[PDB]
Amino acid sequence: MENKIEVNNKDEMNRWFEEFKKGNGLVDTFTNSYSFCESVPNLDRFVFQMASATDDAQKDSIYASALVEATKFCAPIYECAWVSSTGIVKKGLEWFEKNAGTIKSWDESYTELKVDVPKIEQLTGYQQAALKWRKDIGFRVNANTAALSNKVLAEYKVPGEIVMSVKEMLSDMIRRRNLILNVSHEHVDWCREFVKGKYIMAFNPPWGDINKSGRSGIALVATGLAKLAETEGKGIFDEAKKTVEALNGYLDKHKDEVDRASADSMITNLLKHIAKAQELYKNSSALRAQSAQIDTAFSSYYWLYKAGVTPETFPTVSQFLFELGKQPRGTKKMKKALLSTPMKWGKKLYELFADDSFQQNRIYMHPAVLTAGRISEMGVCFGTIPVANPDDAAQGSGHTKSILNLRTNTETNNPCAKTIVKLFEVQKTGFNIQDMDIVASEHLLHQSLVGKQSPFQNAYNVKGNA
Q: In whole angstroms, what is the distance from residue 26 CA to residue 349 CA?
A: 33
**Same-domain pairing of 217 and 338:** no
**Same-domain pairing of 332 and 199:** no
C-beta separation of 251 from 263 below 8 A: yes
Q: In whole angstroms, what is the distance from residue 351 CA to residue 372 CA?
A: 11
Q: In whole angstroms, what is the distance from residue 457 CA to residue 466 CA?
A: 19
**Same-domain pairing of 352 and 263:** no
**Same-domain pairing of 88 and 207:** no
Q: In whole angstroms, what is the distance from residue 392 CA to residue 282 CA?
A: 47
- Check residue 360 and report its DSSP letter: S
**Same-domain pairing of 252 and 110:** no
Kindly compute the dihedral angle of the four CA atoms of residues 224, 225, 230, 235, in this order, to the nearest 10 degrees: 160
Which technique was used to obtain these atomic coordinates?
X-ray
**Same-domain pairing of 176 and 247:** no
**Same-domain pairing of 108 and 239:** no
Buried b (16+ CB within 10 A) or exposed e, 454-464: bbbbbbbebbe
Question: What are the distances in angstroms from CA 243 to CA 202, 240, 250?
Answer: 10, 5, 11
Please say which residue of 250, 284, 318 terminates a domain.
284
Resolution, rounded to a tenth of an Å? Answer: 3.1
Q: Report the sign of the C-alpha dihedral through residues 458, 124, 272, 256, in that order.
A: negative
Question: What are the distances in angstroms from CA 371 to CA 322, 350, 379, 384?
Answer: 18, 9, 13, 19
- Other CB atoms within 10 Å distance of the CB of residue 171: 10
How many structural domains comprise the chain?
2
**Burial level of 337, CB count in 10 A (0-12/13-18/19+)?**
middle
**Same-domain pairing of 290 and 278:** no
Q: In whole angstroms, what is the distance from residue 192 CA to residue 286 CA?
A: 19
Q: In whole angstroms, what is the distance from residue 283 CA to residue 312 CA?
A: 43
Q: In whole angstroms, what is the distance from residue 28 CA to residue 21 CA?
A: 12
- How far is CA 267 from its chain centroid? 40
Q: Is 455 helix (H, G, I), strand (E, B) or coil?
A: coil
- How far is CA 374 from its chain centroid? 12
* Breaks in the chain, after residue numbers (C to N greater than 2.5 Å): 182
**Same-domain pairing of 271 and 367:** no
**Same-domain pairing of 117 and 40:** yes
Residue range of the domain that includes 387: 1-181+285-466
Residue 253 belongs to domain with CATH number: 1.20.58.1110
Please say which residue of 284, 302, 327 terminates a domain.
284
Q: In whole angstroms, what is the distance from residue 208 CA to residue 203 CA?
A: 9
Nearest CA to 305 out of 124, 103, 458 is that of 103
The phi and psi torsions of 219 (rounded to 5 degrees) equal -50, 135
Helix axes 235-253, 220-232, angle to 10 degrees: 130
C-beta separation of 82 from 7 below 8 A: yes
Please say which residue of 251, 284, 317 terminates a domain.
284
Nearest CA to 380 out of 301, 316, 321, 444 is that of 321
- Other CB atoms within 10 Å distance of the CB of residue 79: 27
C-beta separation of 454 from 378 below 8 A: no
**Same-domain pairing of 277 and 267:** yes
**Same-domain pairing of 233 and 374:** no
In DSSP terms, which residues pair with 406 in a beta bridge? 31
Q: In whole angstroms, what is the distance from residue 233 CA to residue 228 CA?
A: 8
Q: In whole angstroms, what is the distance from residue 149 CA to residue 457 CA?
A: 10
